């Protein structure tokens, strides 16, 4: 069962937020160099597939230069039970959006610490003010949790409001969604890119966004912008089945 | 030393964690900073040497 963690996640009402319960976000991926330094997030959407942001794969198109870490809670001191899998293939989204697919060199083992997430409906729009979850080992900016998997419960901000002058001022596209508290203090940051923005829908977690950008981290009136996944579902399906 | 060596460190709007280097005039040193992955400026180097050989 995808989108259903065997360790019940904390609800926290990454800069700010809270350190997550270990293995409560089983689909969280730490994307790495061959050296082994964390520089990006990723989302296990199926045993052989990880969804991430295209900016993470900027420097080299070499899939072997990328490493997928699964079942982790610590960014550096990896748990002994962790899964380290190389990437077999990269798939950049054709209209050049900040979303990309990593095919794993070998399929991940689905355990209670490594479970994939669910894909949304094509063209689905998460309603305004929906409370979603952001996870990752990004910058904390003087906030606690440095080096551990952090989470944040953030409300979805609809693009009509998000593109208001007071906020992002026409920067945000149709294929993007905004999220965060307008008072600031809690947000995704550099190191969280490619990370999952999951929404608890039916009775499970559903991947609705990919950590892309923001004008600074955790700033007032500066919500985070995420790749609207529901716009690329059909593309993702066809990549997984034909490749 | 080219002009952009005097420009400040621009992480950018993105939210990759590319550790990089920028030249710091007021300190006359090449310091570490996080590059976000998109946009920014030429005061952005991958090695400490590349910064030094260019702006120091």
Author numbering:
A (entry chain A): 547 to 559, 562 to 791
B (entry chain C): 3 to 58
Kindly provide excerpts from the paper associated with this entry.
Textilinin-1 is a good inhibitor of plasmin but with a more narrow binding specificity compared to aprotinin. Kunitz-type inhibitors (similar in structure to aprotinin) are one class of small protein commonly found in such venoms. Herein, we describe a kinetic study of the inhibition of human plasmin and plasma kallikrein by textilinin-1 and aprotinin, and report the crystal structure of the complex between urokinase-activated microplasmin (protease domain of human plasmin) and textilinin-1.
P15 makes a kink in the structure of textilinin-1, which positions its amide nitrogen too far from the microplasmin surface to form a hydrogen bond. However, this proline is stabilized by hydrophobic contacts to W761 of microplasmin. The most important polar attraction is an interaction between G39O of textilinin-1 and E606OE1 of microplasmin. On the other hand, the movement of the histidine side-chain in the complex with textilinin-1 reduces the surface complementarity at this site. The observation that the histidine side-chain is out of its position in the catalytic triad in the microplasmin complex and the flexible nature of the canonical loop in textilinin-1 could not have easily been predicted by molecular modelling.
